[PDB]
Symmetry: C6
Subunit: 112 residues, 6 copies
C-alpha cells in the first residue's frame, strides 16, 4: 500500500514510539513514521503514514493516544469527524489531538 | 467442519483480529475470518465462520467483544437470543445487535470523572 | 496405574475459560477433572462431564459447582461445594451418571466492570 | 535438619500444595508434606514437617493461608501463640486455622 | 557517530528504581539519559548527572524533573517539564553544568497504599 | 568495598532474603547478609553489611521492608534520621526503629472490613 503523510502536535505522546499503529475502530490504517520535539515549543510533533485506501478522512477528525489492554502498547485512535469541511492528503495536519494519560497524574487524581 | 458465513458491524473491534474465536457459553463455535473497514462508513465489518452443527441461531442473537481473563486475548461472545413467532441465521446473514470492545481510557475517565 | 473415577454431569449458562482436563477442587483439594465439555445442539448450553476419584463417593445432591480462577491471572477450575445431608428427606448421594443441578457460571470480566461502574 | 510432624484442618486450603512453605515472621521453618481430604467431613487436612530447631512452638499457635506478593505462591503463616499451655511435637495438631481467601468471594464482597 | 550533549545535575530525596542509562523525556520524547547516580557522602541524598542532546539548548531554570514509571510494570524515567520564560526577571536558560532545583522524587508503592488506606 | 555490620529485628520480614539490597534514597549502600529467627523470641533478626563509605548514619535511622514496583523484589529502605546533641552506627550496632513487610491479606482485610 502507498501511504500519505499527516502531522499532529500533542502536549505529551507518552509511550507512543516510531512504528506505533494508527487504528480506526481498532483497525490499523497506518503507523507513526517519526516523533520529534519542536525546537521552539518543546512540544512533540508526530508524522503519520496512512494507507492510501483511507483517503476520505476529514480535517474535523481527531487523534487520542491510548493503550491496548492494561500492560498493552500505545497506539493512536483516529476518530473520523463529520464531513461538510475538507479531506486530509500528503502534508496536512490534524488540529484536534488528545495527549497520552500519565500514570502518576491518575494516581494523584485517584488519591487527592 | 464446513462453516456458514455471518457478518456484523461494530463501532470499535479493539484487539479482535482474524482467527479470534466465536464462543457461545464459552464454547468455541467459530472464528473471525476477516475484519475490514467499510469504504463509506469507516466502520469495521467482521466476517464470521460458524461450524454448521450450530445452525439454529436466531436473528435476536448479539455479539459482544470480550477479553479472556485480565491480560487475555479478545474474542466474540455470541449470545443466542429468544426465538418468537424472528428467523434463523445462515451463510450471508448479518447480526444487527453488536457491542463494541471496551476502551481502557474510557473506563478510567468514567471511574475518575 | 490410575485412581478409578465416577462420571458426573452439570449444565452451566457460561463455562468461560474452563476446558477439558481442568481440575475439580473441594476445599481447594483436587478430587477429579473436567473430562469433556460440549454445547447442546438444541439448548446452546454447555454440558460438562466430570470424573471424580471413587474415594469421594459420599457427595450429596445438594452440592454445587462454581467456575472459579486460581489467583488473578490463574487457570479456570470447578469448585464443588459439599451440601448438607438432610435426614428429614430430599437428600441422596451422587453416583456414576448423576447430574449436579446447582451450578454457577464463570464470571465475565466485562460484567464486573459494567457492574462496578454502571 | 530432621523435622517433626504437625497436622491441621482448614475449610479451604486454596492454592496451597505439597512442598508449599511454612513461614514464621516470613522465615521458612518447614513445608506442607501432604494435603488430603477427610473421607467423612470433606475438609482438607494438611500434614506439616517443621525443622526440629523450632521445637518450642505452643498449642495456642495458629496457621493462616496467605499469598507472597500479588501473583505470588500460597504459603502457611504460623503465628506463635503465648506460653502458659504446652508445646507441639511429632503428631500434634494445630487447632487454630484460617482458610485461604477465595478471589470470587472478595469480588462479591467488594461489589455487593 | 553520536548526538553531542550537555551536562545537568539534580538532587532528589529518593530516586527509587531510576538507574544509569534511564531516559530523560519531554512530552514523552527522549532528549537524553541519566549518566550517573551517586549518594552524597555527607547529605545522604542522591545526586543525578544528566546528558541532554545539544539540540535542546533553550530549557529554562524554572523547568522541573519528576521520576516516573512507563506503564504499571514499566521502567523508571525522568520527566523534564519545560517551565515558563519570564521577561519581567528571574528566568535564564540551563547550560553545561547547571542544576535543576525543582525535582519530585520517585513514588513509593508503600506510601500510596498507606495513604489510600490510612 | 569493606563493609560494617548492623543488626535489626522485625515482626515480619516477608519476601526479604539473603543478598536483598539496602537502599538510601533508592541508592544501594549494602546487602542483607543473613536472616535468622531468634531461638527465644521467634522474631527474625537481619544482619546487614553497609559499604564503609557510608559511615556517618545516626541511631535515629529506621529500616522499612519495601517492594520495587508492583511485582518487584523486596529490599530494605534505610531512612537516615535527624542527628541531635544521638550517636553513629558501626560494626555490631542495632537499628531499634524497624517497619515489617506489608501482608497482602491484611491490606485486603483493611480495604474491605
Amino acid at each position: 500500500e502507498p501511504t500519505y503523510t499527516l502531522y499532529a502536535t500533542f502536549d505529551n505522546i507518552g509511550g507512543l514510539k516510531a512504528r506505533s499503529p494508527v487504528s480506526i475502530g481498532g483497525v490499523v490504517v497506518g503507523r507513526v513514521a517519526d516523533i520529534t520535539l519542536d525546537p521552539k515549543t518543546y512540544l512533540p510533533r508526530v508524522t503519520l503514514e496512512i494507507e492510501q485506501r483511507y483517503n476520505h478522512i476529514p480535517d474535523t477528525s481527531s487523534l487520542s493516544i491510548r493503550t491496548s489492554g492494561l500492560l498493552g502498547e500505545q497506539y493512536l485512535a483516529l476518530n473520523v469527524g463529520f464531513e461538510d469541511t475538507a479531506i486530509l492528503k500528503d502534508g496536512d495536519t490534524i488540529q484536534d489531538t488528545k495527549s497520552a494519560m500519565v500514570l502518576e497524574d491518575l494516581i494523584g487524581q485517584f488519591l487527592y
